[PDB]
């Protein structure tokens, strides 16, 4: 089943490429959980990395472009620079403000994975037969409408012939901008600037995998 379900959607992303599997990673246990939770976890991860990817690349361009002027912190408040590297605009974020960025993600990462309740309905399915799903229920606590992925609802008008043009595209759309990150974000760390890439964040950023540039260490 699980091997057959990729080969149905292999031949839709690229019929010349087709079924891509030399490292044989989609048939086999992670922590010991079986084939049906194998593909759906890898069909999971390939788009979570890709959903951030489109949202990174659009997020990169506008920070190289026009910066955002107001008061950012309560005292001083200068808003780190316009032309300057969004790479190290991320490091020029204050120490406090990085935590609430990470904590609201963890509020959404706690949100994505639980499973349906034993006395009330709260959550969707996980990886047993689940898809790669959205969040779909934002009404469970005392809050107002900030439905995630749904600002101004209207997605109620497309059928199963038409939704496959939106799933499989974003697969390939998310793979482009994923390569669009590392094709650029290496080109600041190294010179080499894949075809030609020059008027840029001119030193290296400094440990792009670092959440926190300076304040606390571990030794």
């Amino acid at each position: 089943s699980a091997k057959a379900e990729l080969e149905a959607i292999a031949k839709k992303a690229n019929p010349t490429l087709g079924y891509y599997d030399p490292l044989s990673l989609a048939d086999k246990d992670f922590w010991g959980k079986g084939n049906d939770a194998t593909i759906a976890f890898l069909r999971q991860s390939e788009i979570k990395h890709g959903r951030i990817a489109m949202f990174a690349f659009v997020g990169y361009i506008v920070q190289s472009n026009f910066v955002f002027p107001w008061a950012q912190t309560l005292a001083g408040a200068p808003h780190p620079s316009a032309d300057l590297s969004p790479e190290a605009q991320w490091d020029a974020v204050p120490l406090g403000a990085k935590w609430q960025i990470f904590a609201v993600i963890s509020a959404l990462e706690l949100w994505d994975e639980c499973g349906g309740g034993g006395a009330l309905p709260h959550y969707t399915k996980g990886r047993k037969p689940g898809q790669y799903p959205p969040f779909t229920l934002f009404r469970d606590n005392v809050h107002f409408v900030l439905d995630l992925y749904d600002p101004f609802g209207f997605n109620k008008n497309m059928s199963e012939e038409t939704k496959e043009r939106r799933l499989v595209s974003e697969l390939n759309n998310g793979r482009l901008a994923m390569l669009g990150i590392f094709g650029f974000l290496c080109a600041d760390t190294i010179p080499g600037s894949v075809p030609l890439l020059k008027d840029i964040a001119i030193p290296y950023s400094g440990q792009v995998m670092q959440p926190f540039e300076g304040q606390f260490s571990y030794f």
């Binding site: 048939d27 010991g32 959980k33 079986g34 084939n35 030794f219």
Partner: protein
């Protein structure tokens, strides 16, 4: 039967020239099976535990009260075994001494057809993992151990006899 057994791969198939699988009963072959399974896992951890302990990976802090991790910026990885103190060497054996018990005290012992030695702590539910792809892994597990049983003997012979191994004698160990 040597046919239908993980460990029989493509380049040799049934590798038994001196006919040792026939030498006893079926209970005999099951003993040699999980011997090689256990000989593998010790040698895989010792070969990999030789390569690091030689490049300077170096746990931060103190191993014991005064014999902290200077055992790596010093003596060879074949050494630093008497440098580990006795109470430190003792709990290693006894965690192993405990781990050899659940291995033996299952409901069915493996020479009576029971299961191979499983993980002592955090035993995920296990190889409910698609038995076609289970057979490919137990070939992977044993072959890496076959290579590691040779390799850990290479690492001992290089530490005793200099020049006993050509493209490996020019290595500081």
């Amino acid at each position: 039967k040597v046919d239908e057994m993980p460990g029989a791969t493509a380049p040799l198939g049934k590798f038994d020239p001196l006919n040792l699988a026939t030498l006893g009963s079926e209970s005999t072959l099951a003993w040699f099976r999980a011997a090689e399974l256990k000989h593998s896992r010790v040698a895989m951890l010792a070969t990999t535990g030789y390569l690091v302990q030689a490049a300077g990976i170096h746990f931060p802090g103190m191993l014991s009260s005064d014999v902290s991790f200077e055992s790596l910026s010093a003596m060879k990885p074949l050494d630093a075994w008497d440098a580990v103190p006795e109470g430190g060497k003792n709990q290693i054996y006894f965690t192993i001494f405990l781990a050899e018990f659940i291995t033996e005290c299952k409901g069915t012992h493996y020479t009576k057809g029971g299961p191979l030695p499983t993980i002592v702590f955090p035993p995920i539910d296990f190889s409910t993992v698609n038995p076609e792809q289970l057979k490919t892994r137990q070939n992977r597990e044993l072959n890496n151990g076959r290579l590691a049983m040779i390799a850990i003997m290479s690492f001992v012979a290089a530490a005793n006899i200099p020049g006993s191994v050509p493209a490996l004698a020019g290595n500081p160990m």
